[model samples]
Target: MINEIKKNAQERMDETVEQLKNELSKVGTEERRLELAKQVVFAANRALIRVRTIALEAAWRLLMLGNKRDISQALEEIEKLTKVAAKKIKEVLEAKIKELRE
Candidate 1:
């Protein structure tokens, strides 16, 4: 269950990144790109909050099911993946924003 949740979260993050890239690519101007980047960051922030909520809920469910041992392992793996997802999203957005600033 925990692995499934992590896989889903990673998949969602991947889809979000691809969608954001595609949308930003359609806007050619640096200013427009920056605007799109802002939109991406905003969307990612919202997504991260939701992801954390999902991770915690999954942990709780595991604990309730008498799988307390799984909780720590699940959270540790998810947190690592979450950080990678957050970094990938933020890095591209920031790089795009930098293009406008320069």
Candidate 2:
């Protein structure tokens, strides 16, 4: 249940990062690059919010038809993955965004 929800969240984040990569690979422009990066950052912000929401509720009892355990192991793991995921997305976009300044 909770695992299922978390899986979906991760998939969505992966897809989001994919989109950013595809967009960047297109080899676009200056203001346009910044513009795209801006939107990418904005999208990442939104994703973090939703991911955090998943964490909160993941423990609360929504993601897993409401879990039933150590609210213990879950948060520890979610935060860890989210930290990586957030950084993954950030670095991906981070690379692209710097091009904007170029």
Candidate 3:
């Protein structure tokens, strides 16, 4: 009957709305988590550029100084750059895990 058809349709819509509500609530935290992940990715890119700049600068300075020059001068800054970037990466991911954990 038409009444039976309408009742089925109503139930389907009602169930869908309830499902949508839970998804809607889930979206906000996921949005926040992705944005924060984006921030960390941005930081990692910046760190790469920072390290690259110093590394090239040292290479050029070595070339200028003539043949295989001051290894320590070039190395110290590069090593520190890697460590700092790695630490920054570790910090952000851990923080996100802590925040988004079930």
Models, CA RMSD each: 3.5, 3.9, 25.2
lDDT of 2: 0.63
Per-residue lDDT tens digits for candidate 1, residues 1-102, read 666766776676667567666665554687776676677667656655655665566556656655556667776777787677667767766776666566
By TM-score, the best candidate is 1
lDDT for each residue of candidate 3 in 1-102, tens digit (9 for 90 to 100)? 323333343343334334433333343478877775565455445544554454455445444554133345444544454455446545544554455545
- Which sections of candidate 1 miss by over 4 Å? 28-64
List runs of model 3 lying over 4 Å from the truth.
1-28, 67-102
TM-score for each of the candidates: 0.63, 0.59, 0.44
Number of colliding residue pairs in each model: 0, 1, 0
* Cα distance off (Å), candidate 2, residue 89: 1.4
lDDT of 1: 0.65
